[PDB]
Design an enzyme around this catalytic site. Sequence first.
Site, PDB file in Angstrom:
ATOM      1  N   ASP A  11     -33.449  31.503 -96.005  1.00  0.00           N
ATOM      2  CA  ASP A  11     -33.937  30.228 -95.515  1.00  0.00           C
ATOM      3  C   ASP A  11     -32.882  29.137 -95.820  1.00  0.00           C
ATOM      4  OD1 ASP A  11     -36.180  28.422 -97.613  1.00  0.00           O
ATOM      5  OD2 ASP A  11     -34.736  29.903 -98.277  1.00  0.00           O
ATOM      6  N   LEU A  12     -32.978  28.051 -95.093  1.00  0.00           N
ATOM      7  CA  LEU A  12     -31.968  27.026 -95.122  1.00  0.00           C
ATOM      8  C   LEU A  12     -32.380  25.929 -96.102  1.00  0.00           C
ATOM      9  CD1 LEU A  12     -30.363  25.236 -91.951  1.00  0.00           C
ATOM     10  CD2 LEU A  12     -30.399  24.392 -94.311  1.00  0.00           C
ATOM     11  N   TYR A  13     -33.499  25.266 -95.827  1.00  0.00           N
ATOM     12  CA  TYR A  13     -33.878  24.080 -96.587  1.00  0.00           C
ATOM     13  C   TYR A  13     -34.475  24.466 -97.926  1.00  0.00           C
ATOM     14  CZ  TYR A  13     -33.231  21.815 -92.031  1.00  0.00           C
ATOM     15  OH  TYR A  13     -32.761  21.405 -90.805  1.00  0.00           O
ATOM     16  N   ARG A  42     -40.592  15.499 -98.112  1.00  0.00           N
ATOM     17  CA  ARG A  42     -40.457  16.949 -97.975  1.00  0.00           C
ATOM     18  C   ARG A  42     -41.819  17.658 -97.974  1.00  0.00           C
ATOM     19  NH1 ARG A  42     -38.615  21.734 -95.974  1.00  0.00           N
ATOM     20  NH2 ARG A  42     -37.854  23.106 -97.620  1.00  0.00           N
ATOM     21  N   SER A 119     -34.770  29.892 -90.133  1.00  0.00           N
ATOM     22  CA  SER A 119     -35.231  28.577 -90.555  1.00  0.00           C
ATOM     23  C   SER A 119     -36.146  27.830 -89.577  1.00  0.00           C
ATOM     24  CB  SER A 119     -34.000  27.774 -90.904  1.00  0.00           C
ATOM     25  OG  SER A 119     -34.206  26.410 -90.964  1.00  0.00           O
ATOM     26  N   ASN A 120     -36.973  26.947 -90.152  1.00  0.00           N
ATOM     27  CA  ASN A 120     -37.854  25.994 -89.481  1.00  0.00           C
ATOM     28  C   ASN A 120     -37.089  24.925 -88.715  1.00  0.00           C
ATOM     29  OD1 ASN A 120     -40.286  27.145 -90.275  1.00  0.00           O
ATOM     30  ND2 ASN A 120     -40.646  25.771 -92.037  1.00  0.00           N
TER      31      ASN A 120
END
Lengths: 225, 225
Positions: A11-13, A42, A119-120
């Site tokens: 995942d990215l974030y 967030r 990712s989202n």
Amino acid sequence: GMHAIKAVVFDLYGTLYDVYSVRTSCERIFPGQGEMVSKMWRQKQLEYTWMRTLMGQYQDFESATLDALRYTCGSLGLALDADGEAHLCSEYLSLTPFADVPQALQQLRAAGLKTAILSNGSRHSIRQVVGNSGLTNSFDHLISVDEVRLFKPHQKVYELAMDTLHLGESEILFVSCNSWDATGAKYFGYPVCWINRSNGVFDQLGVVPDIVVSDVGVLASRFSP
Amino acid sequence: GMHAIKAVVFDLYGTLYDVYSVRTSCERIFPGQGEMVSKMWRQKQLEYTWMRTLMGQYQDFESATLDALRYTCGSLGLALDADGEAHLCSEYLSLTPFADVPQALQQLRAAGLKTAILSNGSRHSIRQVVGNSGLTNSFDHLISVDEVRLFKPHQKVYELAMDTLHLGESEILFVSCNSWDATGAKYFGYPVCWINRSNGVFDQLGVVPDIVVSDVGVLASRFSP
Ligand code: NI
Ligand code: NI
């Protein structure tokens, strides 16, 4: 032949990049209150991904970001003008990478492993954050929930990793700092590595992660060229 | 004909009953961390409902409540034994109604409005909360998410109010203090009342509620005998 990890999917974030990079700029506008505006932003950003997927109302991640910025300030009683909105949002596109991540990623590739982001974020949002960090060459595939118009942890999002990589479930290690995300991917079927950066505790969502490490460099140390 | 309000559907936790009434039990068990425990327990309870639904791993509200409670304690370094779990979990079956609530319920029926609870609660938790506060008579229908194995704000949950009332989408006024829940119903198709008790702001999830009042008492005062 089917059983061994061939790809690491991140995942990215919050795992590769620090979403509280944006506190510095929230601080400028709301002195004294950077941590708290950015912690709420967030949280509500994540909540809105969950609510829209549950409601059948998908809107991409940049949009959800703005909506969450707007809630957060109204909720906290804080004025934010159009120029503030625009600038704080543009700031989500240039989050800082965690300091272990670049070298960790070279070693994962050096150990012969494909690397991907799931990712989202929108296609754009992901390319900005990775591109702006200069780690474009470090990833083999960059996968966006845009492809299916549903957020994490919907099972159709985890499905995109194996379909993009042309690999079996057991061949993909899904890596995340967020328990709830590791947990989604484990229910989809991938082995999972939880990054416990904070010295916290795993979710009680019915599943125990295959691998737990304190940082991505530890994870990397696990593999051999 | 099929355009005017006939019934008022309430959600339970946070609209009719205070989820922070467990606060004193929490503060006794964990001195100096009882508010924190009560906040996080509740927040992680919600997130587990949304997570299970999105991951296709339904488990009832009481199971979610225990899961959240164990997470919450592990996460705060608070140790808790088997009996303390059972104790605190039982407290959640006994929530305290908001001050305004029982008389507001007497006044809405006095107008020939049908009245339901549609709740994430289990069939037992609903009966136990409503039942122990002696408000069982004030609702014509207690409806649990157990009949679909899906939590709010999944659209299939909101469907159950109209099916159980045998009524039209435009004839139900869904009422909640939780804007994400009011939001979910609105996308469903029901007119919504958002009760804004704490004096905040409605979610930026793309809908605006139809009525806003500060209380269920205030809402009840909008309906003539
Ligand atoms: Ni194999
Ligand atoms: Ni009508």
